């Protein structure tokens, strides 16, 4: 599955990182405490634990459910 451009506007349901880790939900502070929440960023599609690029990175990403890995890019290709 692919994303367009830098993935900022990707709104798909992929939730797996490039190392096979599972994305943390954006609204959750567990395991990673963060500020990129749908409450703060209501228009970036920060739904469940779906891969997103709300901060002008270069591809969709997420905080990971591994407490030792803050975040990773998602295992998506560029369209
Ligand atoms: O630690 C955080 O809150 C975010 C770290 C990076 C998330 C991926 N894009 C660059 C910043």
Curated annotation (Swiss-Prot):
Gene of this entry: LPA
Organism: Homo sapiens
Domain annotation Kringle: ranges: 1-79
Disulfide bonds: 2-79, 23-62, 51-74
Biological classification of the source: Eukaryota, Metazoa, Chordata, Craniata, Vertebrata
Assembly and oligomerization: Disulfide-linked to apo-B100. Binds to fibronectin and decorin.
PTM summary: N- and O-glycosylated. The N-glycans are complex biantennary structures present in either a mono- or disialylated state. The O-glycans are mostly (80%) represented by the monosialylated core type I structure, NeuNAcalpha2-3Galbeta1-3GalNAc, with smaller amounts of disialylated and non-sialylated O-glycans also detected.
Stated name of the protein: Apolipoprotein(a)
Taxonomy, superkingdom: Eukaryota
Record's miscellaneous remark: Apo(a) is known to be proteolytically cleaved, leading to the formation of the so-called mini-Lp(a). Apo(a) fragments accumulate in atherosclerotic lesions, where they may promote thrombogenesis. O-glycosylation may limit the extent of proteolytic fragmentation. Homology with plasminogen kringles IV and V is thought to underlie the atherogenicity of the protein, because the fragments are competing with plasminogen for fibrin(ogen) binding.
Membership in a protein family: Belongs to the peptidase S1 family. Plasminogen subfamily.
Whole-protein residues included: 1615 to 1693 of 2040
Positions annotated as glycosylated: 75
Function: Apo(a) is the main constituent of lipoprotein(a) (Lp(a)). It has serine proteinase activity and is able of autoproteolysis. Inhibits tissue-type plasminogen activator 1. Lp(a) may be a ligand for megalin/Gp 330.
């Amino acid at each position: 599955q692919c994303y367009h451009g830098n993935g900022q506007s990707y709104r798909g349901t992929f939730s797996t990182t490039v190392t096979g880790r599972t994305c943390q939900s954006w609204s959750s502070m567990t395991p990673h405490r963060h500020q990129r929440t749908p409450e703060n960023y209501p228009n970036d599609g920060l739904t469940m634990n779906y891969c997103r690029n709300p901060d002008a990175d270069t591809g969709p990403w997420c905080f990971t459910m591994d407490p030792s890995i803050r975040w990773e890019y998602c295992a998506l290709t560029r369209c």
